[PDB]
């Protein structure tokens, strides 16, 4: 019920601006103020600002004054975070939090400040065979190659398949592009009966792919 849903990841060029959404549901929006906290890679989470969802009154951090704009859409029960003059240190995961009992935190929005071109991923099957089978268990997956920037959300059989699933953290390549693999342990008996699909979503690039991984 009580949840805060954030917008998707954005790649932005230096100097530019980012606007992040945060929709409230399972309570009255105006009733509770929102808080914004970012976490830059390997840094402390940093508090950016506060907003009263009721009357729109704000309070910023000295670091974020005159760079951050906290607005609203009360009919939409959405609160906004606008950050201008994007510097390289602003590449962080941004969180919106309801004030009372500091719960719930939103899922976060990864913002990547880079000059590089956005690249959608190419999805390849990690197909099962005898060489990837141990005692009536076959391994299979997807290889989500060369994408920019992070993140890439991966799922199986439209999130109905969870057991055995290992989605690996991404790795930056020589080409400054990312790779990822998602694997799943299934019984060898299901290959040829159950379809295994892996649903890859890369929102900065607006790429969504469903890849049938079959034995060969």
């Amino acid at each position: 019920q009580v949840q805060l849903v954030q917008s998707g990841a954005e790649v932005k060029k230096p100097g530019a601006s980012v606007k992040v959404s945060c929709k409230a549901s399972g309570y009255i929006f105006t009733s509770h103020p929102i808080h914004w906290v970012r976490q830059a890679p390997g840094q402390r989470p940093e508090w950016m600002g506060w907003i009263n969802a009721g009357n729109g009154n704000t309070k910023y951090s000295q670091k974020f004054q005159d760079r951050v704009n906290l607005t609203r859409d009360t009919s939409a029960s959405t609160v906004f975070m606008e950050l201008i003059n994007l510097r390289f240190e602003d590449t962080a995961i941004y969180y919106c939090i309801r004030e009372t009992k500091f719960d719930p935190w939103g899922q976060g929005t990864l913002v990547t400040v880079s000059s590089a071109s956005t690249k959608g991923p190419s999805v390849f099957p990690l197909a099962p065979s005898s060489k990837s089978t141990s005692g009536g268990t076959a391994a299979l997956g997807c290889l989500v190659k060369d994408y920019f920037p992070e993140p890439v959300t991966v799922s199986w059989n439209s999130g109905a398949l969870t057991s055995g699933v290992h989605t690996f953290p991404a790795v930056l390549q020589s080409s400054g592009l990312y790779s990822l693999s998602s694997v799943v342990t299934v019984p060898s008996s299901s290959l040829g009966t159950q379809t295994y699909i892996c649903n890859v979503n890369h929102k900065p690039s607006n790429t969504k792919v469903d890849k049938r991984v079959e034995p060969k």
Binding site: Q62, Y95, G108, L143, F168, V171, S179
Partner: protein
């Protein structure tokens, strides 16, 4: 401005054994009835943080008895009676005495369990990728402990070095294991000048190395 500092920054703790995390401030305690506004958060893998302790020692709703909070003025503690496998994550102390709201760096709590040897599986390149001119060979290591493992790639008896990318998942909450992916990346040209492709795996759980190979 109020700088919070968490003493063990990484903490490997055995199942059933006790754990502690420290937080050093610059005197938390508002004028109002001597309430110290120190809170503890838990960020579990693939999840946004969740507040455990509030007001130094007060457990949030649904928090187990094993979690304890202590402290006065500048030195605070988070103590875990006996660690459970679901306790894997990063822990942040946060103060809300004076604005700006400030946080600790984080403390990654690892778990120590018994040795489990990994299941090895090897994936030959997909023909779809081979049509795009490149060949990736993936070697999967599944549900092992400890995290420490060694994957050697041997192309036609030549030991590869540098042209591989390993990636380890976060520790499992359910069984405290790890899964690792190793990707050896060749070009369709280099990939077709050879025949034998093998990944040799070495780990504490193994009495001898596990080699898993294939021919084209």
């Amino acid at each position: 401005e109020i700088v919070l500092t968490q003493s063990p920054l990484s903490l490997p703790v055995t199942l059933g054994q006790p754990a502690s995390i420290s937080c050093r401030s610059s005197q938390d305690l508002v004028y109002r009835d001597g309430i110290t506004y120190l809170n503890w958060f838990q960020q579990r893998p693939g999840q946004s943080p969740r507040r455990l302790i509030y007001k130094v020692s007060n457990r949030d709703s649904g928090v187990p008895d094993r979690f304890s909070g202590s402290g006065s003025g500048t030195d605070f503690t988070l103590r875990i009676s006996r660690v459970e496998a679901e306790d894997i994550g990063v822990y942040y102390c946060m103060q809300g005495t004076h604005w700006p709201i400030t946080f600790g760096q984080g403390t990654r709590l690892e778990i120590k369990r018994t040795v489990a040897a990994p299941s090895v599986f090897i994936f030959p390149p997909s023909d779809e990728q081979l049509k795009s001119g490149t060949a990736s060979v993936v070697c999967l290591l599944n549900n092992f402990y400890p995290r420490e493992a060694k994957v050697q790639w041997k192309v036609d008896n030549a030991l590869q070095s540098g042209n591989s990318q390993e990636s380890v998942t976060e520790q499992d909450s359910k069984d405290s294991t790890y899964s690792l992916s190793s990707t050896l990346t060749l070009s369709k040209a280099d990939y077709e000048k050879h025949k034998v492709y093998a990944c040799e795996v070495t780990h504490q759980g193994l009495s001898s190395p596990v080699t898993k190979s294939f021919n084209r």
